[PDB]
Amino acid sequence: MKTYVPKQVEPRWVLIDAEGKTLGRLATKIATLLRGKHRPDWTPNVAMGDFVVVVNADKIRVTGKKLEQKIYTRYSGYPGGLKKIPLEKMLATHPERVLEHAVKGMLPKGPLGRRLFKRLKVYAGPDHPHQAQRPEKLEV
Amino acid sequence: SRIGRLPIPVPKGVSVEVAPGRVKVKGPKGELEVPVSPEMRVVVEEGVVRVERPSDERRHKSLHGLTRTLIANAVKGVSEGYSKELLIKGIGYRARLVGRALELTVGFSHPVVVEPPEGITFEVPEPTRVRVSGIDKQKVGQVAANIRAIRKPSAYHEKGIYYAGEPVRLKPGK
């Protein structure tokens, strides 16, 4: 007997409210959903996890003094091109990127991992534009 | 040996209503909202407000005295109000009231007009005394600190803007 390999499946669209949840502990669950490891037919070499919609991403929570002391960093390739953005400022300017970054770092590197990241749709504020997909509300 | 335990006399007629995280104090001179830690409990009694803490841990012991004083400062502010007095010293130095604003001539090449924030009143009884008054104790002391900072007391001469009661301490020169 060979191990079961699934034929392609309709993905499950899912909706998660970010308000009040801790940044890192929410991200690990989203990553699990994107990989589809909650699914009994999980297969490592095809994209078969959920599509994850997240709202209220600007209301994510964080412990200690991370609002001031967590620094995001970007290197432009130029001399002096290291930019340091504190978490506070990122929330004030591109708040959806806090969760996106946290999740992306928890997905595998490579073509499949980049594909899985596109299946995550993060929104600040309580609304998302994906009624047509009828996302299933999740409590995590 | 405790400010938090000390009950707060409430003069009639001042009303102290409690809400989660805040205490609202209304009196003859205005209202003040006091933000209060949700770990503390503020209790209304007959002509008395009291604050209680839920343990003997350092943080609760620290918030206990703070919360009592802030509530008491609000009770005083709406009934008595607060004021601070500034003495201007030095030959040419003087103040006057331009409208309800304060104009200081204190040795610069120009005057210094200070606009009153909401809830602050300026008075100039004599040209060398300035009164700052309002219901908010923290604000009164802040505006007063700002006006003193225009021209601080000199290290060598009785010249500058002084708190009333501030001791004049000088250094010799030559």
Binding site: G77, Y78, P79, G81 | -
Partner: protein, 204 residues
Amino acid sequence: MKGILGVKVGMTRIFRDDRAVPVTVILAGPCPVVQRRTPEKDGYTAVQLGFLPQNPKRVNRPLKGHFAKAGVEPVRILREIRDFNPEGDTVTVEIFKPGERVDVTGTSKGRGFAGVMKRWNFAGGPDSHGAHKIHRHPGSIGNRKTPGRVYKGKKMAGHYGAERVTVMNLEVVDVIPEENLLLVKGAVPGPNGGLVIVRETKKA
């Protein structure tokens, strides 16, 4: 913000209060409003100006449909002025008065492939004392094994000019509405006959 499209016509000097004032002459208007950008429709505010009438027998259909929806004759250039909403339907030199300061944008003259000395004002090499075929060369471009590479943005030979350049805070010396003429004190990018944009200065 207010602006107008123009043509650089030439340079001369005038006499003002017994002073010779170098000027660039610019033929600016008249500029029809061809489209307006609104926050509801486009997400920002600007006016699309037209300039220089064109032979309709040179204007293809999608452009013609664009003009006609505006009730505008066929024009040679369309450019937008950001954050400008003129009341009329035609922008002319009269939006500027003498004494105002303006920013002027044009396409600078094209040096083509330019050496390090012309493009970056490098010092080049000695012309005697043994200098060997490096009189106009850049010298070293780096270090050694650390970092073993050349920085991004390293100044090197290459194309230079024929690029957008803004010169800021130029005094308007005169306005001649009869001939749609703006006189601006000083130098303005590009050749005579080049397209320019004149805007109210951003320098306070």
